[PDB]
Amino acid sequence: SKVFNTQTFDIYSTEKDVVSLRDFANDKDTLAYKRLAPKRTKDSPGMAKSELKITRVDPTTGVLIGIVNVSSSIRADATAADKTALMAIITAAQADGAWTELVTDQRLPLATV
Amino acid sequence: SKVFNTQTFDIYSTEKDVVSLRDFANDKDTLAYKRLAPKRTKDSPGMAKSELKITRVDPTTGVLIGIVNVSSSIRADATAADKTALMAIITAAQADGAWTELVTDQRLPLATV
Amino acid sequence: SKVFNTQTFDIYSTEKDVVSLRDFANDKDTLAYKRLAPKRTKDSPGMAKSELKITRVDPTTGVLIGIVNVSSSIRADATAADKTALMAIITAAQADGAWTELVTDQRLPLATV
Amino acid sequence: SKVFNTQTFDIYSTEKDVVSLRDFANDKDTLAYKRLAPKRTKDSPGMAKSELKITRVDPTTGVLIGIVNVSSSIRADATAADKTALMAIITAAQADGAWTELVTDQRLPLATV
Amino acid sequence: SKVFNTQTFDIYSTEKDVVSLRDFANDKDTLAYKRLAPKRTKDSPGMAKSELKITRVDPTTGVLIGIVNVSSSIRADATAADKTALMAIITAAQADGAWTELVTDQRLPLATV
Amino acid sequence: SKVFNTQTFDIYSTEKDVVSLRDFANDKDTLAYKRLAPKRTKDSPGMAKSELKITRVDPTTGVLIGIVNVSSSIRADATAADKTALMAIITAAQADGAWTELVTDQRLPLATV
């Protein structure tokens, strides 16, 4: 939406189901919010997809440095408590240092230290 | 690794590249740490993949309630500054209310309030 | 044979190698003892098979709730020492909490606690 | 898991769904815990398979003396009371001498004594 | 298992018959424990293979600096006295200076000094 | 070179790139020092192979009891610091108890104790 990690993200593009934001300062980060509503294709009401990804591309040759994507896929009938729990758990795990080592090290949380 | 959102996640399974944890209390939440090291298929050193996923299924009828997935695809040579900035932005974005509303509402960050 | 887990099991049917008992009180539990004598198909004296299974079905709609089966396959020549050791080990393992969690949790004995 | 029938069983192998332990003292007993999660193939949520087997193989020629296996197959939706009743009934039947005769004797519980 | 040569080795990956440890500090040293059970392909009980190897790969371009591997091939029936003697002789020879010359100099124990 | 594990090893045969020592007392243990120079088959200066193996053969019928072999494959250009580190890590790992379990038990460093 707005300033994250001391970088200001302004809207660059808006689609029916995608909003894209760029820094416009370092011209290397794009933040995308993506939306797929659930489709009642059976007795199930479908799963509501979301996607929040940050892409970093160096602005000299256009090489993709890296992508971090947060994707959610939750039942349309699912409760807010179910949806609150899923984000609370994944947020606590991200704050944990195991995830910080899973990224940057390819290290699983099974070390005996 | 351990207690997230006040729930204790004890190890459920271990693979070559996946470590799965279960609450075993509510018997419904599984946290997986997935690893995919870069492959030097060309002059590029490859992309180091990681995946941090939380799954909730109700353990009586076994219908998937929801999945929230955190995936990373970062160049093997990418500097930790690029790597840390990628984590800093996405965690800042997640803590922001736009991500909270993208889930639970399928609301894109374009509302005029 | 007779009262197990405070439930009285009266004989329900008899076969050449199977004896089946029923509670007849909750009309839902059936205990089967199955026999399979070793056959000397080669220089081996064969394997003596036994089976002790408990079956629960709800006696209104007849859906199987669950089965627990205790099967044995012991050489006909095997000494009573090996047979007693096998029973002692398996009963000790069942009395241990690891079996109690493997059932009702699908939890393998690998948690670090 | 640990000492059973005065024998220390230590981890020898860990799979996705099997844990194998050996005595490492008499080098003849292997205890395996095995896990199959229920699969929702229909309106039924599936059956959760457990297996607890003790195999004895004498370590001079490696011939299988005997196997005692405890297998459970319980509905995913089944109540914890159902599983408790199943385990209690099967353990009480195992503690009875009828099972101790069925094993080692191929004797059905129908004698008049 | 743990700190060797003042460097900390944490478990990098766990396999059925392989356990691998990575320094994760210098990101160039990998210690692997490999297992291979003896096979009774004949009257003989087979040879029990073990492997303990350290591999150094330069972590900027990926050039293998060196490998020191310790492999064992011991009869499945061999006594613990043989197994202790084999490990004792080879460990003493490694502590001898002739090994430190065979490595780093390719000097055989035949020079007259 | 000389007395290892309180056994006297005297030179049995001398080759161009192999030196072999025999106990000559138990007439069952042979220690071999094998050499192999690096080959500059390309731009790379090649890999310098070393080998230190102890072989036990039963000296009445000639049945191989076991072999423990230490082999090195180090870049011809590798620094002495790399070569010292490689020998230091592997020697420390052998002195660790995990090796003494991998040999004589085929126990991997993954048991939870």
Side-chain angles (χ1 to χ4, degrees), chain C residues 1 4-5 35-37 49-50 56 63-73 75 89 94 96 106 109, chain D residues 1 4 7 33 35-37 49 64-73 75 82 85 88 94 96 103-104 106:
Chain C
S1 46
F4 296 135
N5 193 45
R35 199 240 319 278
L36 225 46
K49 265 64 161 203
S50 98
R56 174 165 283 201
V63 58
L64 159 84
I65 319 295
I67 319 167
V68 183
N69 204 297
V70 181
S71 276
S72 80
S73 177
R75 284 181 61 81
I89 288 162
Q94 275 175 274
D96 178 40
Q106 301 271 293
Chain D
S1 45
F4 297 136
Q7 312 171 41
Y33 295 77
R35 197 244 314 275
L36 271 43
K49 292 345 182 275
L64 159 83
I65 298 181
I67 299 164
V68 184
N69 189 358
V70 185
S71 274
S72 89
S73 173
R75 261 180 94 80
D82 283 308
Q94 275 173 272
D96 183 15
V103 185
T104 72
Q106 304 277 272

Side-chain angles (χ1 to χ4, degrees), chain A residues 43-96:
Chain A
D43 47 68
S44 99
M47 322 275 298
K49 277 29 158 164
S50 99
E51 202 224 35
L52 172 61
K53 58 186 200 236
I54 172 76
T55 280
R56 172 162 285 201
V57 174
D58 89 344
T60 172
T61 178
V63 60
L64 161 73
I65 297 182
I67 301 165
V68 184
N69 188 359
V70 184
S71 275
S72 94
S73 177
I74 289 138
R75 261 181 95 81
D77 53 29
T79 75
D82 279 310
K83 265 190 300 283
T84 305
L86 281 168
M87 313 191 278
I89 292 158
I90 202 63
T91 278
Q94 277 171 272
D96 193 78

Side-chain angles (χ1 to χ4, degrees), chain E residues 1 4-5 7 35-37 49 51 56 64-67 69 71-73 75 82 88 94 96 102 106, chain F residues 1 4-5 35-37 49 51 56 64-67 69 71-73 75 82 88-89 94 96 102 106:
Chain E
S1 46
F4 299 133
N5 195 39
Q7 337 163 201
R35 206 236 311 275
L36 201 43
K49 301 329 174 304
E51 181 146 330
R56 174 162 284 202
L64 166 67
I65 282 165
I67 298 162
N69 189 357
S71 281
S72 274
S73 181
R75 263 181 91 71
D82 313 328
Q94 281 173 278
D96 182 4
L102 181 67
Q106 301 252 309
Chain F
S1 46
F4 299 133
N5 195 39
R35 206 236 311 275
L36 201 43
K49 301 329 173 304
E51 182 146 330
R56 174 162 284 202
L64 166 67
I65 307 314
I67 298 162
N69 189 357
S71 281
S72 273
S73 181
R75 263 181 91 71
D82 306 330
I89 289 159
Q94 281 173 278
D96 181 3
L102 182 67
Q106 301 252 309

Side-chain angles (χ1 to χ4, degrees), chain F residues 30-105:
Chain F
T30 279
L31 194 59
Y33 292 75
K34 178 193 141 293
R35 206 236 311 275
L36 201 43
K39 87 179 186 339
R40 190 174 314 252
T41 192
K42 51 180 175 315
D43 47 67
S44 93
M47 304 295 297
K49 301 329 173 304
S50 96
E51 182 146 330
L52 172 64
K53 38 188 216 273
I54 174 75
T55 285
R56 174 162 284 202
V57 190
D58 158 71
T60 173
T61 177
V63 48
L64 166 67
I65 307 314
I67 298 162
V68 185
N69 189 357
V70 181
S71 281
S72 273
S73 181
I74 286 141
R75 263 181 91 71
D77 51 39
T79 77
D82 306 330
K83 304 218 214 85
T84 306
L86 279 162
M87 302 185 13
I89 289 159
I90 198 65
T91 289
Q94 281 173 278
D96 181 3
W99 188 60
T100 318
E101 297 237 77
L102 182 67
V103 201
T104 68
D105 251 336

Side-chain angles (χ1 to χ4, degrees), chain B residues 12-14 59-63, chain D residues 15-16 35 37 40 45 76-77:
Chain B
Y12 180 79
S13 180
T14 292
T60 200
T61 196
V63 54
Chain D
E15 257 172 80
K16 161 62 171 109
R35 197 244 314 275
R40 179 157 256 284
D77 54 36

